Amino acid sequence: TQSLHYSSPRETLTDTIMMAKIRKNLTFEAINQGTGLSLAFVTAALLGQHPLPEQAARVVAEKLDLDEDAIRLLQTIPLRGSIPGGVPTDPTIYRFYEMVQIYGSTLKALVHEQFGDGIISAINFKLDIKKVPDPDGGERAVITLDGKYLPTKPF
Amino acid sequence: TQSLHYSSPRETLTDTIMMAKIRKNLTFEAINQGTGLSLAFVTAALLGQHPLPEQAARVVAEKLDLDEDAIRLLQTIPLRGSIPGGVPTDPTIYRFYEMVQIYGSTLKALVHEQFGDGIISAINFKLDIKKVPDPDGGERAVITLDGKYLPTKPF
Amino acid sequence: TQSLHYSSPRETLTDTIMMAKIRKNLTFEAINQGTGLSLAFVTAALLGQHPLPEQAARVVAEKLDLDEDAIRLLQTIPLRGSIPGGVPTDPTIYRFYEMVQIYGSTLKALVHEQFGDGIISAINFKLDIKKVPDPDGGERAVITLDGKYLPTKPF
Amino acid sequence: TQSLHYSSPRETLTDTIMMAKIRKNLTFEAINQGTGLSLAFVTAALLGQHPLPEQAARVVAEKLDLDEDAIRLLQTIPLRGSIPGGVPTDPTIYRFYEMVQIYGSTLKALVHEQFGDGIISAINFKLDIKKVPDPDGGERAVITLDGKYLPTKPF
Amino acid sequence: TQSLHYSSPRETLTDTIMMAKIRKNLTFEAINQGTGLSLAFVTAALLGQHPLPEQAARVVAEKLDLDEDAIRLLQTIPLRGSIPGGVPTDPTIYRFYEMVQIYGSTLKALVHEQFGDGIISAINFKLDIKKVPDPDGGERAVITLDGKYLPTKPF
Amino acid sequence: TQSLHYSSPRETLTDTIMMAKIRKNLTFEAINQGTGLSLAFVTAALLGQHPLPEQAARVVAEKLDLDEDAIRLLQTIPLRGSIPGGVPTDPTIYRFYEMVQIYGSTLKALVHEQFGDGIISAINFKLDIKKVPDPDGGERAVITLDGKYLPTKPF
Amino acid sequence: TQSLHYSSPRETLTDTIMMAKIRKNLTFEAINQGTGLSLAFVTAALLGQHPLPEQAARVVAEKLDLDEDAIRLLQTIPLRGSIPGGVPTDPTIYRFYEMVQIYGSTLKALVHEQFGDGIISAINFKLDIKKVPDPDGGERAVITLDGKYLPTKPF
Amino acid sequence: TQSLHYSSPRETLTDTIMMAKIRKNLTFEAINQGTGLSLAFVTAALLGQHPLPEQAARVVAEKLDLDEDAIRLLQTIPLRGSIPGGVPTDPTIYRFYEMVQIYGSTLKALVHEQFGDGIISAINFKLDIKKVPDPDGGERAVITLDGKYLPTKPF
Amino acid sequence: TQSLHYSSPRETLTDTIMMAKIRKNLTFEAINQGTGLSLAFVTAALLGQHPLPEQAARVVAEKLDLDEDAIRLLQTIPLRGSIPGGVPTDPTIYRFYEMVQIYGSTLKALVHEQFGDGIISAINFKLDIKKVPDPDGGERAVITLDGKYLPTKPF
Amino acid sequence: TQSLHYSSPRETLTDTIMMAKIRKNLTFEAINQGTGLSLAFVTAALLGQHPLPEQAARVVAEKLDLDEDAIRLLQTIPLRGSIPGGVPTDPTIYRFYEMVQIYGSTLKALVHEQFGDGIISAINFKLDIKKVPDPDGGERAVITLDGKYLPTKPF
């Protein structure tokens, strides 16, 4: 599997992908049909944050009219990071940034209390988002972060 | 309810609290017994990120030997933010920072797709962390971020 | 409704829009005639900070000679943020930045005093700017920031 | 009237003031009674962003048990700025920071359209906040930014 | 009068202007002939920091062979700021930056002593530079900053 | 003459000086009587940006009740810089910062036109501020920057 | 095991430890005797980057004359990060920082080629340093970074 | 031997090289066959961080279809630095960044203990990565940093 | 003599110069033959940091096949600074950056001790570099920084 | 030989040294009498940038009335760097900073031309400053930076 150490070719691809998605008026859920992969993972890959396996890459390429150069690029491991400069201004992204700003030390404390010294991994890791009703009317998003605990032991 | 626009008084209190917790070899779970509140909310308050209502404030104060000045301060709305400078270096906190760097654009894309224009709130919001076994051996943390959808609509 | 996680497409559109606006010597008030929406909301949309509903997108498109790709793009939720880098140097924008720098702690203190723990929303939110004569000669701008109170409550 | 070019003494005073306010459980509204000044201005001065005239100073000092050294310092013109580092993390302050991030270019555009070249002043300027009921239930804050237009003219 | 909230189109015009000036080997003094306006103001406009009134724009355009699109853009209010990133590295500009770094606190102090609370305006403001002989041989520059005093008054 | 490469001892002295000035309700003008030096230079020195010659140092020390350690320290060359972090938030200081942000390129351009390649010195340099009436009512500050031209020549 | 979300108490212990070590003229090798742990791990713990298990803590405390408050603190999980601000100026540290700046893209590329998508872990991880003779005379340091490969797999 | 003080032309070459590598689905190991150089050095050079000697340059160029301008450019000493901004967000690169953030002070301390005052060179220096099995299953990367000790001595 | 307040046209010229130097395999020493100017000055000008007198411009242009527009631009005063962002990552440049980081305070201390208050000029200034043998084997660079002392005196 | 990974103890020692030097009105040259070491090295050590051999430490200690704990600390290897935050504001230090900003790329270009790939060392390195008459009146400083060339060789 190929990889890239800089983001501009993948950003170009992502732009090609989004213009096609917008022009065709598609959703990510529809684009993900028949990929054999979860919506969060594929969306992230279309947005330039993951490689797709070859067959998944071809499925989405069929729906967005991507050529073979794009299909190859879609298979490459990218230089990751979806917030240029690290600090988001977009309110939608910023709210998630803010959750970590506020609860970061709480997360550290409760990880060390319930698991021990070490980390919750962001690589052995799955993310999903679910829409649920709010009892007081309206709707809520429940975002689940599921990471493996990796301990820090004396060596 | 009182509030502060600067962080040093709560930081001083948080340090008082942590030294006591360490001296008495207590856990956050133990300190939270009887508050009638969630562990994540009360831990966050002890770490300077929330005000406690007075009953919960007195409950934690007894466990930690906190005086009436400390109890008053625990009831004040703080200046929130748990990562000085915004960018963490501690690996445990960084992993959660990293999840947002990588999946931020995905989180935005799918919120907009499944909800609409707007945000998932970081204020009308609940967080909890659960430990579950990994089938392959070891442990996993499942962190739930649960926020109200707030639409952006024209005016 | 489509969305974008990067700003370059809307930036290009915004530049197309401003060049047309300047060539035709139009005002934002005249471009907004017929949209059934507030001047500030539609101006911000033209400047790449909001999506327009299709009716309003077509109305402004006619005045500016915008094609169908441009009309589709005007309807996409953008990656928001109108000050590159966060810190403005333009004096006009900087004065509003300075108002928050100076009165930020005061706004916090009084929000918590008069409403309680929580925030004044920037999403459930309206802005408008009004021109009124100054008695001493000259003119004043009255800018109204109108946001919903959202409480922070224990969980 | 005296002035200071560094903030720490005034920071110390502000801390003294807030600890007495919390200890006595006072509101800013109560503290401001009989000062002859607006709540926003006096709150800002207590929080270290403005001098108070001598008599207003003595009035608040009586209520907060401040001595003559504090009364003298309350009258000094401070080094202004209430967000250390300029970028707030506290959600309540951040929301107002965000309004300028999002609507900054719109504010510039409509100022130039409706007034002309120049600025809306942050000095010949008044701020206030009102609490108004929301028709759909709940409460809203209406913050008014009232600034003199200062034109830029060719010299 | 039109305005822009982003600098790139104006930056492009400024480059066109500077390439014309270098090609024809003009001085700003010679370009300014017949504008009826001050050299510092018109120079700043050419370098992208001010609009020109139409007559002055046509005068300088004739000398630099600018077309109607340029003349029109030269009349637009720009996004101001002449130092990308705020901190200059060019020694000539840096010296002026350094004067403010060193004397900033003195300026504040003497403003409040001699005028009172408030600012010296950077908008109701004129700048000029004069060359005068140094008695010991060589030359001095006398740069004059002439701004309106705007008081801060309790409200 | 002695020098310091770090600022904390002068900052402490400057604080002592200011607390005495505020306590005695002195002006800088009164403090400067009989120093044989200009107000801007001595004010800068009091604010920790310059050394004073021994006798000027003693003249100001008599007025502010400084001992012989302060008098010795007043004669030391400091680590200069009066804006911590370089970017001011205080509106009074910021306006002078903003003059350089806006007119920086103009100053460079006119310096090279009228003098040639090189710089206007910030060292072989004098500053002064004057208060003059505004014919349209009110008052203006005229700040004079008087620097020696230092050419850049091929070597 | 206890943990701290802020560095100040551990920084104080580290200072105590370093002053003892310097005063007694001890080496990290001599302090590590009888811990049963690697020199690099225990050194990092003494410098505030890891907790020690109790036995090791008591062993090193005996050699440094640390009391029980310190032995308890030495067992707590710290807020990790040994370079304030992230960017080192000290030449010895900077060279290691430099290796990553230069070879960072190479490490990425070869990790993805030889292992696949994912990371080399900084947690399931051992470091050691060895001194070896340079044949040309002089000495070399062979620093070994030994981390678990954690794959990124599509989900 | 030629050199460049800016990175863009080398970044363009690097993009050309990567696009050919991805197109032909080559590995760095395959590309490196017959260069007479180690994998880490040649990979670094291909990625813009090192010059290649002429014959090695021609060997890789034959495999990637690079012309003579590319071959000349491959032989130039570049402006080194592989992480724009210095701080990586890509998890693979960040992990190596993190090892230095956490073990920085430890590396310094043990260099001075085992070698003395001075540095471990990043120039008289060799890097290599090795894949080894993990006893508990899976795989480990062993990265070797091999640098010359350069002493600091009184002069 | 003409000047530029932005670097892009000069950066383009520098690139044209370097692509020709690499294509023709020239040295700076060779390009400089017959300018009657020091190697350090002309190299800096070729790299965009100085104007050349017309004669030198035409001499170097002949060797690099530069047209008249290039010759004209080589004579313009540039916006100076050779390290984008101020902090170099390239190791060759960084070592010189590091010398100032380490010896900055010593340089200040000894300048004031041996000369007095004021500066060593970076404008009335010459730089040169000499290759000399190291007695212990190898070579040393002796870089000479030759600047005029400009006093700071009380005014 | 002891070392430290943080600067505060050495900063305190340096303050003690400077306060003694000022009180006794000593020069660095006088403090350095009898060390056997160059003025530049010993001045840097006193300012916290190098360790002294015990003999030199005790010599300078006798002149400054330093106790035994200070003598011990003076022999420790420090965490080096003499400009907090890396970017100087003090004009005297900034001029040296500026020389590297302007001539950085030229130094790189000529190092590679005259030596080859690699660096000029900042560690195998000597610094000195000489006062020289200016032929046209006044004084000059000649700062000599003398470093070992370290080659970068393909491996």
Structure tokens at F18: 């200011």
Residue H76 sits at the vertex; the CA angle it makes with H75 and H81, to the nearest 5 degrees, is 120
Q: How far apart are the first and last CA of chain A?
A: 33
Helix, strand or coil for residue I131? strand
Query: Which of chain H's residues have a Cβ under 8 Å away from the Cβ of B101?
Result: 89
What distance in Å separates the CA atoms of residue J7 and residue J5, rounded to the nearest whole number?
7
Contact A23 C69 (CB under 8 A): yes
> C-alpha distances in angstroms, I45 versus E73, I7, I127, I144?
34, 13, 13, 19
- φ and ψ of I120, to 5 deg: -95, 125
**I95 a catalytic residue:** yes
C-alpha closest to that of B83 among B70, B98, B73, B68: B98
Residue I56 sits at the vertex; the CA angle it makes with I53 and I58, to the nearest 5 degrees, is 105
Asked if J135 contacts I113 with a C-beta cutoff of 8 angstroms, the reply is no
- What's this structure's resolution in Å? 2.1
Task: Identify the helix (H) or strand (E) that includes residue A61.
Answer: helix A54-64
Query: Which of chain B's residues have a Cβ under 8 Å away from the Cβ of H104?
Result: none
- φ and ψ of J139, to 5 deg: -130, 155
F65 burial (CB, 10 Å; 0-12 / 13-18 / 19+) is: exposed
What distance in Å separates the CA atoms of residue B43 and residue B56, rounded to the nearest whole number?
12
**Where chain B is broken, by preceding residue (C–N > 2.5 Å)?**
none
Query: Which of chain I's residues have a Cβ under 8 Å away from the Cβ of J118?
Result: 92
DSSP I134: -
> Smallest CA–CA separation between H25 and chain J, in Å?
25
Selecting among I29, I54, I62, I98, the annotated active-site residue is I98
3-state secondary structure chain F: CCECCCCHHHHHHHHHHHHHHHHCCCCHHHHHCCCCCCHHHHHHHHCCCCCCCHHHHHHHHHHHCCCHHHHHHHCCECCCCCCCCCCCCCHHHHHHHHHHHHHHHHHHHHHHHHCCCEEEEEEEEEEEEEEEECCCCCEEEEEEEEEEEEECCCC
What distance in Å separates the CA atoms of residue C99 and residue F88, rounded to the nearest whole number?
14
Residue I123 sits at the vertex; the CA angle it makes with I122 and I127, to the nearest 5 degrees, is 65
Question: Strand D118-133 vs strand I118-133: parallel, antiparallel, or unpaired?
Answer: unpaired
Greatest Cα-to-Cα distance within chain G, rounded to the nearest angstrom: 56
Method: X-ray
- List, in sequence order, the alpha helices (H) in chain H: 8-23, 28-32, 39-46, 54-64, 68-74, 91-114
Query: What's the alpha-carbon Rg for chain C, to the nearest Å?
Result: 18
- List, in sequence order, the alpha helices (H) in J1-155: 8-23, 28-31, 39-46, 54-64, 68-74, 91-114
Helix, strand or coil for residue E72? helix
Contact J110 I40 (CB under 8 A): yes
Which residues have C-beta within 8 Å of that of residue F137, sequence separation ≥ 6?
A: none
Residue C125 sits at the vertex; the CA angle it makes with C122 and C128, to the nearest 5 degrees, is 115
> Smallest CA–CA separation between E22 and chain I, in Å?
6
Q: Which of D49, D101, D118 is nearest residue C83 as measured by Cβ atoms?
A: D101
Query: Which of H129, H146, H155 has the highest number of chain J CBs within 10 A, making it the mutation to test binding with J?
Result: H155
User: Locate tokens 């962001």: which residue?
Assistant: A122
Greatest Cα-to-Cα distance within chain E, rounded to the nearest angstrom: 56
Q: Which of E3, E116, E126 is nearest residue D1 as measured by Cβ atoms?
A: E116
Asked if I118 contacts J119 with a C-beta cutoff of 8 angstroms, the reply is no
What distance in Å separates the CA atoms of residue B155 and residue C146, rounded to the nearest whole number?
11
Residue D55 sits at the vertex; the CA angle it makes with D54 and D56, to the nearest 5 degrees, is 95
Q: Which of A14, A23, A90 is nearest residue C79 as measured by Cβ atoms?
A: A90
> Smallest CA–CA separation between B22 and chain G, in Å?
6
DSSP H49: S
Asked if C70 contacts C57 with a C-beta cutoff of 8 angstroms, the reply is no
Asked if F94 contacts F21 with a C-beta cutoff of 8 angstroms, the reply is no
Task: Identify the helix (H) or strand (E) that includes residue J140.
Answer: strand J139-151
> C-alpha distances in angstroms, F77 versus H155, I118, J25?
27, 9, 13
Domains defined along chain H, listed by start: 1-87 (1.10.260.40), 88-155 (3.30.1160.10)
Q: Which residues pair with B117 in a beta bridge?
A: none
C-alpha closest to that of C82 among A25, A129, D100, G122: D100
User: Locate tokens 């963490």: which residue?
Assistant: B88
> Smallest CA–CA separation between C108 and chain A, in Å?
17
Task: Identify the helix (H) or strand (E) that includes residue C9.
Answer: helix C8-23
> C-alpha distances in angstroms, A61 versus A42, A65, E44, H24, J56?
12, 6, 51, 20, 73
Helix, strand or coil for residue G115? coil
D67 burial (CB, 10 Å; 0-12 / 13-18 / 19+) is: exposed
> C-alpha distances in angstroms, D44 versus C121, D39, D58, D86, H56?
22, 8, 16, 17, 69
Residues of F with CB under 8 A from a CB of D: 11, 14-15, 18-19, 21-23, 25, 47, 82, 87, 89-93
What distance in Å separates the CA atoms of residue J8 and residue J26, rounded to the nearest whole number?
24
Query: Which of chain B's residues have a Cβ under 8 Å away from the Cβ of A105?
Result: 44, 47, 49, 82-83, 93
Selecting among F95, F113, F139, F140, the annotated active-site residue is F95
Residue F98 sits at the vertex; the CA angle it makes with F83 and E79, to the nearest 5 degrees, is 140
Question: Strand I139-151 vs strand J139-151: parallel, antiparallel, or unpaired?
Answer: antiparallel
Q: Sheet of H139-151: strands edge to edge?
A: G118-133, G139-151, H139-151, H118-133
Residues of G with CB under 8 A from a CB of B: 2, 4-6, 8-9, 69, 72-73, 76, 79-81, 83, 86, 122-123
What distance in Å separates the CA atoms of residue J152 and residue G76, rounded to the nearest whole number?
44
**A98 a catalytic residue:** yes
Q: Give the burial string for D6-15 (b: 16+ CB within 10 Å, else e).
A: bbebbbebbe
C-alpha closest to that of I49 among I32, I24, I74: I74
Structure tokens at H85: 């901004």
Structure tokens at I71: 């010759």
Our answer on whether D and H touch (3+ beta-carbon pairs < 8 Å) is: no
Which residues have C-beta within 8 Å of that of residue A60, sequence separation ≥ 6?
A: A31, A32, A35, A42, A46, A52, A66, A74
> Smallest CA–CA separation between C69 and chain D, in Å?
23
Asked if D126 contacts D146 with a C-beta cutoff of 8 angstroms, the reply is yes
What distance in Å separates the CA atoms of residue F23 and residue D69, rounded to the nearest whole number?
8
Asked if H137 contacts H143 with a C-beta cutoff of 8 angstroms, the reply is no
Query: Which of chain C's residues have a Cβ under 8 Å away from the Cβ of A17?
Result: none
What distance in Å separates the CA atoms of residue A46 and residue A50, rounded to the nearest whole number?
8
Q: Give the burial string for E114-150 (b: 16+ CB within 10 Å, else e).
A: bbbbbbbbbbbbbbebeeeeeeeeebbbebbbbbbbb
Residue B120 sits at the vertex; the CA angle it makes with B117 and B125, to the nearest 5 degrees, is 160
I115 burial (CB, 10 Å; 0-12 / 13-18 / 19+) is: buried
Structure tokens at H94: 């960040």
Question: Strand G139-151 vs strand F139-151: parallel, antiparallel, or unpaired?
Answer: unpaired
**I11 a catalytic residue:** no
Query: Which of I49, I71, I79 has the highest number of chain E CBs within 10 A, making it the mutation to test binding with E?
Result: I79
DSSP D142: E
